[PDB]
């Protein structure tokens, strides 16, 4: 599967990911320091038997931005695919939804993209 390990996005954010044989993604967001106050849980799913036609491996995961120290009242989902080979990558599009009032629901969800590599 090649997914398990530490991944870094284009801005250097760090994600520790374990790909279970059953399709589970588990792990954490860590800060550059790895301090407890900036650690958040991630959970998701991936295709544990991808196509053998050189297609990437579809996946997704979520981080809710609460831990025992901080709560931003928001959550991000990343949707994408893992691409193996010499320079393995996870190419994703993300949505960041913040909890809002109904009046402010229109501005609840930011969109962007993250590309993850096994090197900083």
Numbering used by the authors: 15 to 134
Can I see the authors' text?
As a proof of concept, we used this platform to identify both known and novel L- and D-amino acid peptide binders to the well-characterized model target, streptavidin. All peptides bind within or near the biotin binding pocket of streptavidin formed by two surface loops [1/2 (amino acids 22–28) and 3/4 (amino acids 42–52)], and by antiparallel β-sheets involved in an extensive polar interaction network, in which residues Ser88 and Thr90 of β-strand 6 play a major role. All eight L- and D-peptides discovered in this work bind to the same pocket of streptavidin in distinctive binding modes suggesting (1) the rich malleability of L- and D-peptides and (2) the ability of streptavidin itself to adjust the flexible loop to accommodate multiple peptides with diverse sequences and conformations.
Two 5-mer hotspots, “wqeea” and “lanvd”, were selected for the extension step with all 160,000 possible combinations of D-amino acid dimers. In the common “wxxea” core of these two peptides, the D-Trp forms polar contacts with Asp128 and contributes an edge-to-face interaction with Trp108, whereas the D-Glu shares a salt bridge with Arg84. D-Ala is critical to the core motif because its short sidechain perfectly accommodates the limited space within the pocket. The positions “xx” of the “wxxea” core face the solvent and therefore are less specific [Supplementary Fig. 7(B,C)].
